[PDB]
Each structure stands twice: as C-alpha cells, then as structure tokens.
C-alpha cells in the first residue's frame, strides 16, 4: 500500500505562476491558511495544482491534476478549497484557452491611470515604474485586490484577508510603466484615536511578487510611500503592522539611509547625547514611531561610535 503515495506537501503541489511574456513559475512559502496547519494533502497521487495569473490583470486560472484519488468520504476537495480563497466567479478553471481570451480581452480597457492617483515614479535597469494608490470602494480596485489578495496568505506568515468595506483602507499599486504589469502592492491603513483631521498611517501588507524580488523594488516602493506620507501634513505618525524578519531588514536599511541624507549621521555624533525635547521634535519631524526611532538612534550610535 504505502500511504505516502497518497500524501503530498501542499507547498510542493501548489505551483503558482505569473504569465506575461512567459510563465514564471514558483512555490508558495505558506499553504496552511488553505490546506491546514500540517500543509499536507492526503488522498491524491501525482497531485499538481496550477494557479496562474495574467501579469497585467491578474486574472486567475486554476487546474488540479492527479493520476488517482482515494474514495474515502473526508478526502478534501483540493480544487474547491483553493477556489474559496480566490474571487467568486472570476476564476477560469481547466479551460486554458478561455482564460487567455478573457484576459487578452480585458487587457484592452485595463487602465489604472484613468482611475488611480499617481504617487511617484522611478527607474531600475532602464525601465520606468509607477506607484499609484486607491481606495477599495470602486469596482475596479476591489476586483484587482481580490485577485492579488491570495499572495499575502501564500507569502506572508500570519496574514489574514482585510475587510474591503472598511473605508480606512488604501492600496498602493506598483506597475511597470510601459507594460502595465503589476509588480507588487501594499495595503495601508489611515486611523486616528483623538477644519481638517490628523491620522496615523500604517503599512499592513507589503508584497512584491516573487518574479520581481531582489531587484530594488521593495526599497523604492517603500521609500515612495514614506516620502509621500512625509509630505502629507495630515499624517502624524508612520508605523508598521507586525513586520517579519525580511521586512524589518528592509525598513531599517531605507530608514537609516533617509536619516543619513538628512545629516542625522552627524547629529548622533555629538558626544553629549541630546535633549529629550530635541529627540521628540526630531522624531516628530521624521514621522517615525518611537520604537523604530529609538532603534534607529541605537544603530546610528555604534555606526559612528568614536
Ligand atoms: C508589514 C509587512 O507587510 S511585513 C510582510 C513583508 N512581505 C513579505 O514577506 C512578502 C514576500 N516578500 C516580498 O514581498 C519581498 O521579498 C519583500 C517586500 C520582503 C522585499 O521586496 P524586494 O523587492 O525583494 O526588496 P529588495 O529589492 O530591496 O530585496 C533584495 C535585498 O537585496 C538587496 N538588493 C537591492 N537591489 C538588488 C539587486 N538588483 N539584486 C540583488 N539584491 C539587491 C536589497 O538591499 C534587499 O535587502 P537585503 O540585501 O538585506 O536582503
Ligand atoms: Ca499586532
């Protein structure tokens, strides 16, 4: 018999791919939100779950394949499970040609420049990239969000789907200027506690799709959002919601470099510390959260520890 022939790792079985010039395939970092804590699937032989997205519109495509399957009652429906996390009635299953027709057609009217507000632009290896932002009230943004949303669960541990009806949500979209392909996205939250109003802005989910990582995007995208928030007088403080090891490292690298270009390198090189009211005034200037500010101060001290 051997029950391992019917058991498979959900991380190895689920193959995700973003399709543009060609399909670039990769594995998820996490599958437990969908296939359970053990991240194992029981009851299928030669299991292969294909999850693909158009590089521009992110139109989902699903295709589950297996050589055989168990007849037991409680054998999990691999396909149904995946679909439950994907946008309802927006996924093309099995019919690959139908999928291509759908997205090649949609690619015609698909334009984020007509509905979204541009936030910034930058260049990495000759190519231009644009950062746009939007709420989740309009149909277009809601549609795109429900398509890319699953990436948070597959690559960000402890992530959960946000409530799209909460008006405090605002997404930032990073795309290739000329090709309009979605490179990454960021869900942010404007909240306060106690003429115009003030708010604290926090980064909740930050994601650059796997085929585009390690190229400088996350840094540029982060810097674009921060610089944007710094310029917005209504934003009091900028904080990050439960960052992981990788994001902490990114947050720190860009924060350090921003403070240094402002000359803080030398300010924290004054052998007599500094006033509390001065540390407060500068923390407010930088809009950083106290915990982060103090960490940055610490890093800037051993850096130039004379
Ligand atoms: C609150 C938050 O949401 S926490 C959740 C964070 N999100 C995730 O973990 C989702 C999965 N991962 C991702 O979306 C991305 O990998 C992120 C957001 C973590 C980082 O985005 P990236 O676009 O890959 O960032 P970046 O391009 O700076 O990453 C590569 C690293 O190589 C360096 N680097 C920069 N350019 C290049 C390049 N061309 N080639 C190689 N390395 C490069 C960077 O300095 C960076 O920091 P590191 O050396 O300490 O690791
Ligand atoms: Ca928390």
């Amino acid at each position: 018999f051997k029950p391992e022939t019917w058991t498979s790792s959900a991380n190895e079985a689920l193959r995700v791919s973003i399709v543009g010039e060609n399909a670039v395939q990769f594995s998820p970092l996490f599958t437990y939100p969908i296939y359970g804590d053990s991240e194992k699937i029981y009851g299928y032989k030669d299991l292969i779950i294909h999850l693909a997205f158009d590089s521009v519109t992110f139109k989902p495509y699903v295709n589950v394949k297996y050589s055989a399957k168990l007849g037991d009652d409680n054998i999990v429906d691999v396909e149904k499970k995946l679909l439950s996390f994907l946008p309802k009635d927006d996924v093309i299953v099995r019919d690959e040609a139908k999928w291509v027709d759908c997205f090649a057609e949609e690619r015609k009217t698909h334009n984020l420049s007509d509905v979204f507000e541009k936030v910034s632009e930058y260049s990495l290896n000759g190519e231009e990239f644009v950062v746009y932002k939007s709420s989740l009230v309009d149909d277009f943004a809601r549609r795109m969000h429900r398509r890319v949303q699953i990436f948070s669960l597959l690559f960000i541990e402890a992530a959960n789907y946000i409530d799209e009806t909460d008006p405090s949500w605002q997404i930032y979209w990073l795309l290739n200027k000329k090709t309009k392909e979605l490179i990454g996205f960021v869900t942010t939250y404007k909240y306060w506690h106690y003429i115009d109003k003030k708010f604290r802005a926090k980064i909740s989910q930050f994601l650059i799709f796997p085929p585009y990582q390690n190229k400088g995007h996350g840094s540029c995208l982060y810097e674009a959002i921060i610089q944007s928030w710094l310029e917005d007088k209504s934003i009091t403080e900028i904080t990050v919601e439960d960052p992981n090891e990788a994001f902490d490292d990114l947050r720190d690298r860009n924060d350090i470099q921003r403070l240094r270009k402002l000359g803080y390198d030398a300010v924290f090189q004054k052998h007599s510390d500094l006033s509390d009211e001065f540390l407060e005034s500068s923390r407010k200037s930088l809009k950083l959260e106290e915990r982060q500010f103090n960490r940055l101060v610490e890093m800037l001290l051993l850096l130039n520890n004379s």
Side-chain angles (χ1 to χ4, degrees), residues 1-269 276-304:
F1 179 50
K2 297 95 200 67
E4 323 83 44
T5 56
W6 302 98
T7 303
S8 58
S9 175
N11 293 294
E12 307 186 348
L14 178 63
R15 291 103 160 276
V16 188
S17 57
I18 293 165
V19 188
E21 187 189 64
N22 49 87
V24 35
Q25 190 177 292
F26 47 97
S27 284
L29 289 177
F30 306 100
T31 55
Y32 75 87
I34 306 176
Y35 297 110
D37 294 356
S38 68
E39 290 184 324
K40 281 289 179 293
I41 296 171
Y42 183 67
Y44 297 73
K45 181 185 178 301
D46 301 355
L47 218 202
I48 293 179
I49 312 169
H50 292 277
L51 173 52
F53 302 87
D54 169 39
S55 67
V56 175
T57 65
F58 272 74
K59 180 67 187 183
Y61 168 78
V62 174
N63 193 234
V64 179
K65 287 182 301 185
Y66 49 99
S67 52
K69 169 179 178 173
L70 253 30
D72 304 331
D73 276 24
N74 293 138
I75 291 295
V76 62
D77 187 340
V78 160
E79 189 187 293
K80 183 173 186 172
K81 270 294 190 182
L82 185 46
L83 283 282
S84 72
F85 289 91
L86 289 167
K88 185 196 279 73
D89 304 319
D90 190 47
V91 188
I92 306 301
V93 182
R94 192 141 84 170
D95 196 1
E96 187 184 322
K98 170 59 176 66
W99 174 58
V100 184
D101 301 344
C102 247
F103 76 62
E105 194 51 45
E106 195 184 328
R107 269 175 169 186
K108 294 169 177 285
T109 50
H110 180 269
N111 195 91
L112 305 82
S113 318
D114 305 319
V115 287
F116 298 170
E117 186 186 335
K118 184 173 296 183
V119 179
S120 165
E121 289 194 19
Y122 66 87
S123 297
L124 297 169
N125 208 14
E127 293 191 291
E128 297 184 274
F129 294 93
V130 284
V131 186
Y132 292 94
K133 67 171 174 185
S134 70
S135 69
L136 288 177
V137 302
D138 75 306
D139 298 78
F140 182 62
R142 273 189 174 186
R143 192 179 67 197
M144 289 301 305
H145 185 240
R146 303 179 218 176
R147 292 180 181 196
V148 298
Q149 215 181 33
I150 200 170
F151 277 91
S152 302
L153 302 195
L154 300 178
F155 299 100
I156 304 173
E157 188 181 344
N160 279 77
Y161 282 172
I162 68 176
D163 187 314
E164 56 171 46
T165 63
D166 192 332
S168 295
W169 286 115
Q170 184 172 66
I171 317 303
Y172 289 72
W173 314 91
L174 175 67
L175 54 141
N176 178 304
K177 190 173 188 185
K178 70 146 52 185
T179 77
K180 301 185 190 305
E181 298 174 308
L182 189 63
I183 309 307
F185 70 90
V186 188
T187 67
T188 69
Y189 201 86
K190 284 194 309 300
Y191 64 108
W192 194 236
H193 323 262
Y194 191 52
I195 306 177
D196 50 82
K197 301 178 179 180
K198 298 291 178 175
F199 309 102
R200 293 166 174 228
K202 75 172 159 62
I203 286 174
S204 184
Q205 301 165 149
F206 194 106
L207 194 149
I208 298 294
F209 304 118
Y212 310 127
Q213 296 173 355
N214 297 298
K215 293 185 188 296
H217 288 297
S219 305
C220 290
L221 180 55
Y222 174 66
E223 203 47 60
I225 299 175
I226 293 300
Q227 194 46 58
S228 167
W229 283 346
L230 256 25
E231 296 178 18
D232 183 11
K233 301 167 185 173
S234 63
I235 296 304
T236 297
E237 188 185 39
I238 294 171
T239 173
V240 178
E241 187 79 273
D242 316 306
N244 51 33
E245 176 76 78
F247 192 69
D248 271 332
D249 288 349
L250 184 149
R251 181 197 200 172
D252 293 354
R253 192 181 58 262
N254 282 74
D255 281 348
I256 285 296
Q257 191 181 335
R258 186 187 318 119
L259 259 56
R260 278 195 285 102
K261 186 165 188 169
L262 296 176
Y264 281 94
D265 213 4
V267 172
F268 299 132
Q269 181 64 292
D276 294 348
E277 29 285 303
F278 170 76
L279 289 176
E280 181 77 344
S281 64
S282 65
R283 178 178 68 78
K284 296 189 174 186
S285 296
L286 299 173
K287 296 194 187 185
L288 277 317
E289 69 168 354
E290 198 159 70
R291 297 275 248 90
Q292 182 60 7
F293 173 85
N294 297 144
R295 287 189 63 253
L296 292 174
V297 170
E298 181 168 18
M299 284 178 255
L300 284 165
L301 287 180
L302 80 167
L303 175 63
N304 40 263

